[PDB]
Amino acid sequence: LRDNIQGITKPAIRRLARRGGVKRISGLIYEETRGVLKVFLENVIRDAVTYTEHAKRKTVTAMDVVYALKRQGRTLYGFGG
């Protein structure tokens, strides 16, 4: 098993860090980032499901998450809505 959020791999988090422009990365940063990454879904998936639960559908649409991202102030283009 790898379900402990460690499936978000060290070099993938480091590549996001490199696109973010940061230099030397201390070895606890990957795990601190996995903590933030969970909490971002504990906002976004949770509210997106409250929009899925507006229609009470089984399928989450790209609209459902775009509405959650809109109320959370991080709007997204290309998917529409």
């Binding site: 988090i13 996001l16 860090a17 696109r19 973010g20 422009g21 940061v22 980032t33 933030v36 990454l37 971002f40 879904l41 976004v44 998936i45 997106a48 790209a62 998450v65 775009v66 991202l69 991080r74 997204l76 998917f79």
Partner: peptide, 15 residues
């Protein structure tokens, strides 16, 4: 994909 794009843009902002 809309989730992952929002996540990775959010983490690039954090970094």
């Amino acid at each position: 994909m809309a989730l992952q794009e929002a996540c990775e843009a959010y983490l690039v902002g954090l970094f």
